[PDB]
Swiss-Prot record:
Induction: Expressed late in the viral replication. Changing E11Q: Complete loss of activity. This is Endolysin. Its EC number is 3.2.1.17. It is found in: Host cytoplasm. Pfam families: Phage_lysozyme. Gene3D superfamilies: 1.10.530.40. It is an enzyme of class 3 (hydrolase).
Length: 162
C-alpha cells in the first residue's frame, strides 16, 4: 500500500464532473474544480486544467495525471509549511502518508488548523492524538474516511485499508 493506493480508495475515480461530499464540482480522483455553484465555471476550470476542450469528460490517463500533480503538490505544500514540515519530519513512512491524505482533502490551511492534534502526533502520543482528531467537523462530516486516516495515525500500519 502507498499514498496513491490509499487516496484512490478514499476518493474513488470518476471521469465525468461530479459533486463532492460538500457539494463542490470535482472530477477524477478527488480533484476539486471550483467552489462555485456554476457547472459552467467548473467546465472552464476543467478545460484549463487539461489543456483541451473537454466538455466535462476526461480519460483515465488525464485523471491520473491530475492525481500525480495533486499528490506532488500536497507533499510540497507540507514541506513548505512551517507548521506541517516539522510534524512530517517527525513521523515514520506510514503516518506520513496519513498526513498527506488529510492535506489532500482539506488543504494545508485546514490541516494546519489541527494544531493540538499535530502537537500530539509530534510527541508520538498516538491514542491521545486519535481522540483529539475525532473532535472535528472533519470526523463528523466524513466519519468512515476519517476513521481510516485516524487508525493509520494510531497504529502506524495500513490495517484500515486492508
Ligand atoms: Cl490544475
Ligand atoms: Cl467517509
Amino acid at each position: 500500500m502507498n499514498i496513491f493506493e490509499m487516496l484512490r480508495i478514499d476518493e474513488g475515480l470518476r471521469l465525468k464532473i461530479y459533486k463532492d461530499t460538500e457539494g463542490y464540482y470535482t472530477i477524477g480522483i478527488g480533484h476539486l474544480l471550483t467552489k462555485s455553484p456554476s457547472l459552467n465555471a467548473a467546465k472552464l476550470e476543467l478545460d484549463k486544467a487539461i489543456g483541451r476542450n473537454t466538455n466535462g469528460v476526461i480519460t483515465k490517463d488525464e485523471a491520473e495525471k491530475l492525481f500525480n500533480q495533486d499528490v506532488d503538490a500536497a507533499v510540497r505544500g507540507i514541506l513548505r509549511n512551517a507548521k506541517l514540515k516539522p510534524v512530517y519530519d517527525s513521523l515514520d513512512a506510514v503516518r506520513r502518508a496519513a498526513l498527506i491524505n488529510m492535506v489532500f482533502q482539506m488543504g494545508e490551511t485546514g490541516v494546519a488548523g489541527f494544531t493540538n492534534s499535530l502537537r500530539m502526533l509530534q510527541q508520538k502520543r498516538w491514542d491521545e492524538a486519535a481522540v483529539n482528531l475525532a473532535k472535528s467537523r472533519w470526523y463528523n462530516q466524513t466519519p468512515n474516511r476519517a476513521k481510516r486516516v485516524i487508525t493509520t495515525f494510531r497504529t502506524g500500519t495500513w490495517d484500515a485499508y486492508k
